[PDB]
Every structure is written in C-alpha cells, then in structure tokens.
Design a protein around this ligand. Structure first.
Ligand SMILES: CC(C)(C)c1nc(Cn2cnc3ccc(Cl)cc3c2=O)cs1
Ligand SMILES: CC(C)(C)c1nc(Cn2cnc3ccc(Cl)cc3c2=O)cs1
Lengths: 203, 203
C-alpha cells in the first residue's frame, strides 16, 4: 500500500502518468492533492505516512526523505487586464511588491523562500481557484500554474505580467520527495523513468 | 560608461553575446568576473557602481536593482571516478552530506540557500579551477558549471554523480540584476533580446 502526494501546481494530466505505472508494481496507490504551500509541511508529519511527494516547493533536506527532479512546469504572474500593471507599469516588473498579492496560505502559517509572498499587501487563499477568482475581480495579482490560466488568457479574463521577467512563462522545477526505503527497488526507478518522459512531453 | 558583472558560472561564450551588443549602444563597457558566491555581495556595495550582474545566485530583492531571467545553464556534481559515490553509493544521492564537499567560499563569509554547502565536511575555494583541481585529487566532490567539466568528463579524469538526481545535468537559471535606471532606455531591452536568444542556442 503506497501514499503519493501531488501539489495542485502539478498538471492533473501528469497525475495519470504515474498512476498507470505505479499500479503495475503496487496493489494500492493513494493519490493526495495539497497546496504547494502544504506539500513539504505534510510529509514532515510521520503520522501522514507519505511515501512520495510531487511538489514545486524546495527544501534543503527532510528526515527519511531523498529529493530528485521529475521535470519542469510553467507559471505566470496574472492580473485583471485593467490592472495598473498591465502595460502602464508592466516594464516596471518590481512594482509587484507595491500592489496586493493573492498568495497561497499555508496551514503551518509559514512559507518557503519559493512560495513566501513578495508584496506587503497579501491576501491568503487555500487553492489556485480562490486565487484566480479574486484576481479576475481585480482584487490583486497572483502566480498560478499554466494549466489554471490557459483558458482565462485565451478568454482575455486574465492578462500575463511575467513575460519580460521570464519569456515563455516562469520555469519551475518539479521535485520528487521519496521515502529513503524506495531507493533500491526497480519499481520506483520504473516510475521515475516514465514520470520523467511523461512530464518531458507535456512542455 | 557601463559596468557589467558576469559570475564564473556563465560560459565565457555568453560573455561575447552581450559585449558585441552593448558597444553598439555604450561607449565604454567594463566586464567583471566574480565567484557566483561574490556576485550579489558585490553589487550590494554602491561604491562598486555595478549596473548589470549576470549571475546564477538568487536573492528576494536588492536596493536600486531589478531581477529578470536571461536563460538556463547546466551544472554537474562531479568526483574522482574512484570516489566512493561513483556507482557503489551513486543511487544513494543524499550520501553527498556525508562526503567532503569542495564549495566556493564567499569573501562575505556567508552564502545564499542556492550556493551554501550541503556537507558538514566542507573545503572552501575562490574559483571552479581550484575546486576541480582538488576534486581530480579525490579530496572531495563539487558542483561545477558544464563548460568547466566538459573536457575532464570526456577524458575520464572526472565522473558525474548528478544524473539520477537530474538527468541532463542540473538546470540553473541565469538572472540579470540591473540598476533600476536602465528599465526605460531601448538600449537595455536590445541587450536582453540578444542576450536571451544568444544564451537559448548555447543549450
Ligand atoms: C515573485 C515572482 C517574481 C513572481 C516569482 N516567484 C517565483 C516563485 N514561485 C512562486 N509561486 C509559484 C506558484 C506556482 C508555481 Cl507553478 C510556481 C511558483 C513560483 O515559482 C518565481 S518568480
Ligand atoms: C546540493 C546539490 C543537490 C548538488 C544541488 N545544489 C544545487 C544548487 N547549486 C549549487 N552550486 C552550483 C554551482 C554552479 C552552478 Cl552552474 C549551479 C549550482 C547550483 O545549482 C542544485 S542541486
């Protein structure tokens, strides 16, 4: 019986790539979604008995847990197209610290360097849906995964601010945190191989 | 008159891409090499009067300085091919904390999250040459830029440990830190455009 944690920044297309592989080898595979803000916090509770976390969050090192890289994924800074930063201050880039950010909150109340808010005017939410709902309402700007802003950018509901900072979207590593135990069995290695190929072609 | 800082992790091929561009627009262009460990430390001294830093090091935000991404570059974990971690513990990956690291020292004595050593047994050096000299001598392992370990890996002098952690080498963003002043003049934007194209095709 195996527990796997995917944060809500991992496209749910990926979430199949593993699932088809892991059931070849394992009898029971439990998939658990979490805020990227909650991914590392969670696996650090032993009682949670997580054996794999796919998350964008980075941490020096965790107890009974090895890190590797599965691949890369995109994120944009988005705001309401009428937003002061659309074009008028767009070239400014570092203006973001002065406008209100819609940031993912953490249950733990504290954040990594990566996912810590950058503005002093912050409004915390649990998930990317809440974030973008508020961002469409012109309440603030936010950083969301590509799969969450695809539709809205085509619709013109949302506008990108990040293109000058990082053309093509903000490249973000996807880490695999894995219980040290798995490091030997060919099963885990099959999963990595597939998972890597299967997220390579999603670019 | 314009001062530009390239850390020693930026391939010196790149270091031309800019230089050909910047002299179209500027009359005097001063190129300054620094340890990636010293790049941000340096520009934070106003008396240094740096107007651009190309560095792999990341920092939340700097005074009178905006950040953007020029592109990506490779880094490998290397050790002497006889090294205990070649193959015998290679799959271990997190063993690195237990073997001696050859880390870039900083003049400032302190390091970013990114460039901070990961082993407790550290041996600091000024530059990647010293690092690899010691790594060939089997004294410890180290993380070096691709351009520095190309030859030695073909020669078999050095071996990669990083391939399971991150197939293809460790992707590392190259940031451009730029004095806020430049954000308006078309000159800087020409430089970014070129610099981005010119580092894209170096992959
Ligand atoms: C603050 C600024 C410049 C906009 C950046 N911040 C990050 C760090 N960061 C944060 N939140 C994210 C959420 C989802 C995803 Cl998919 C990625 C990120 C991310 O990289 C980078 S670039
Ligand atoms: C500790 C470990 C797992 C091996 C990693 N550390 C980094 C962070 N890091 C550090 N030193 C570097 C030097 C040159 C270059 Cl080109 C890149 C790096 C780098 O990414 C990543 S992966």
């Amino acid at each position: 019986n195996l527990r796997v944690l995917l944060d809500t920044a991992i496209p749910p297309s990926f979430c199949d790539t593993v699932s088809s592989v892991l059931l070849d080898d394992f009898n029971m595979v439990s998939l658990i979604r979490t805020s990227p803000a909650d991914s590392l916090a969670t696996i650090k509770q032993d009682n949670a008995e997580i054996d794999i976390a796919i998350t964008i969050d980075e941490e020096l090192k965790i107890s009974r847990f090895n890190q590797c890289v599965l691949g890369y994924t995109k994120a944009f800074v988005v705001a309401h197209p009428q937003h002061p930063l659309c074009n008028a201050s767009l070239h400014s880039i570092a203006s973001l610290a002065n406008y209100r950010q819609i940031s993912l909150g953490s249950r733990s109340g504290q954040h990594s360097n990566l996912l810590r808010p950058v503005s002093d005017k912050v409004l915390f939410v649990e998930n990317f849906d809440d974030m973008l709902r508020l961002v469409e309402a012109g309440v603030g700007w936010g950083i969301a995964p590509h799969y969450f802003v695809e539709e809205r950018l085509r619709n013109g509901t949302l506008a990108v601010l990040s293109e000058l900072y990082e053309p093509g979207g903000i490249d973000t590593k996807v880490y695999c945190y894995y219980n040290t135990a798995l490091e030997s069995e060919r099963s885990f290695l099959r999963f990595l191989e597939s998972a890597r190929q299967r997220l390579r072609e999603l670019g």
